Write a protein that binds this ligand. Sequence first.
Ligand SMILES: CC(=O)N[C@@H]1[C@@H](O)[C@H](O)[C@@H](CO)O[C@H]1O
Ligand SMILES: CC(=O)N[C@@H]1[C@@H](O)[C@H](O)[C@@H](CO)O[C@H]1O
Ligand SMILES: CC(=O)N[C@@H]1[C@@H](O)[C@H](O)[C@@H](CO)O[C@H]1O
Ligand SMILES: CC(=O)N[C@@H]1[C@@H](O)[C@H](O)[C@@H](CO)O[C@H]1O
Ligand SMILES: CC(=O)N[C@@H]1[C@@H](O)[C@H](O)[C@@H](CO)O[C@H]1O
Ligand SMILES: CC(=O)N[C@@H]1[C@@H](O)[C@H](O)[C@@H](CO)O[C@H]1O
Ligand code: NA
Ligand code: NA
Ligand code: NA
Ligand code: NA
Ligand code: NA
Ligand code: NA
Length: 401
Amino acid sequence: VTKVISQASPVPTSIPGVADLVGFGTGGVYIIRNSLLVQVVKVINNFGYDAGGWRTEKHVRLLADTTGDNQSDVVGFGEDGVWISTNNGDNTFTDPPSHVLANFSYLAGGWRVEKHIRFMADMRKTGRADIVGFGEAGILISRNNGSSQFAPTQLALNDFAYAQGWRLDRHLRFLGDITGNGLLDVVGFGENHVFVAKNNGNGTFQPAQAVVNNFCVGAGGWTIASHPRVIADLTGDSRADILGFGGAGVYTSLNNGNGTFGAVNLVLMDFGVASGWRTAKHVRCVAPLTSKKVGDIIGFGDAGVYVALNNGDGTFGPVKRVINNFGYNQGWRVDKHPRFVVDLTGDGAADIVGFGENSTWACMNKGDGTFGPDMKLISDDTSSKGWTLEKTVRYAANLYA
Ligand SMILES: CC(=O)N[C@@H]1[C@@H](O)[C@H](O)[C@@H](CO)O[C@H]1O
Ligand SMILES: CC(=O)N[C@@H]1[C@@H](O)[C@H](O)[C@@H](CO)O[C@H]1O
Ligand SMILES: CC(=O)N[C@@H]1[C@@H](O)[C@H](O)[C@@H](CO)O[C@H]1O
Ligand SMILES: CC(=O)N[C@@H]1[C@@H](O)[C@H](O)[C@@H](CO)O[C@H]1O
Ligand SMILES: CC(=O)N[C@@H]1[C@@H](O)[C@H](O)[C@@H](CO)O[C@H]1O
Ligand SMILES: CC(=O)N[C@@H]1[C@@H](O)[C@H](O)[C@@H](CO)O[C@H]1O
Ligand code: NA
Ligand code: NA
Ligand code: NA
Ligand code: NA
Ligand code: NA
Ligand code: NA
């Protein structure tokens, strides 16, 4: 499946891949390298609640390859600027980090978690991640010129920002390739339309185009509170399609190939409000779980994990409960226990990992969207050891492969 960057998952993982685990703890940054010999390693005495004053409410902490060597670096949008610790290649990182740009931050640029969105993305196919912010006047990009040299911001597009009415309480913004050229374009679920903007390849976009009169708060009644939406390749043409978890169930609009979109269809009467699904208590994802390399549906519900497998064309097979765990009825809580659907084995079929009450747990995908037994990986990065949502950040991320 293709690289999609979203508000919900700003650190994309690779398909295929062997994702590592990263924790921005109170004392700093810790990693669990995906390997046969499992352990927790502290790598930076920074980017933490008690290690530099990092706060979920004011700052953004991410992983992205900022150098082009295919290793992920630690990036923090802090109080006064953007701070980077680079991956040394051997499960260590530079410490202290370096401040590379006095912008995209609370006091330098006036950026706010409540109003603005900050991502890291290779926007020009350089192999390096540029800074991309949806701010006040539009989308601002700082070009990564290599060797920690970040160009001052340029207004990539005068849209998808606070001045054009975009709000985190009402709308969704994504980066994803909707044309097939390998460049990340902008997809925005606005007030009355899904808009797209095509990437020019040089740090700017074409003007936005309304492509679907649906999936929005003012078109079809789609709320952030009840109806999560994603973009993902549902068909295998490498272009992002639209999928929504609506009232009745799952709605899709398939990309025509060029970033225009087809009809809106209800393709599955499950995973919606009508079948009991709730943003407050459940996790719904789209990720490849089989050899077809298209988006399948995963849902951490009450009784456990439910999957519907894509037939290969954006329609789905029956819903099956594949694991009687990671669900609400086994004590998993959206506000305490992060759960991710990511490739941990390198075969292209996404696995399940969860940071539980006492242990990190995983289940291996057998390659066909069925799973093995719940495996206990390690008793760290968990609630019981002080890792809370309010004070810490945890990701699955490809640090190397
Ligand atoms: C939240 C934040 O920006 N924290 C930074 C910290 O990472 C850095 O070590 C320090 C250097 O003086 O400056 C603080 O502002
Ligand atoms: C929150 C926000 O968008 N702040 C930007 C700032 O990052 C940029 O340096 C400046 C340049 O004019 O424009 C502001 O609007
Ligand atoms: C929040 C939202 O949807 N804002 C859009 C804006 O992006 C678009 O450029 C404008 C002109 O069509 O229409 C507004 O409603
Ligand atoms: C939030 C939601 O599910 N909205 C759907 C909308 O997308 C669909 O177009 C309409 C008629 O089919 O039914 C609404 O309930
Ligand atoms: C919120 C939730 O878990 N809903 C599930 C639904 O997906 C499933 O189709 C049904 C039959 O197993 O069981 C419900 O409890
Ligand atoms: C939220 C959480 O961690 N729940 C786990 C559950 O998945 C596991 O089946 C059980 C028995 O080991 O232990 C619980 O603590
Ligand atoms: Na790198
Ligand atoms: Na490196
Ligand atoms: Na900040
Ligand atoms: Na594109
Ligand atoms: Na597609
Ligand atoms: Na896998």
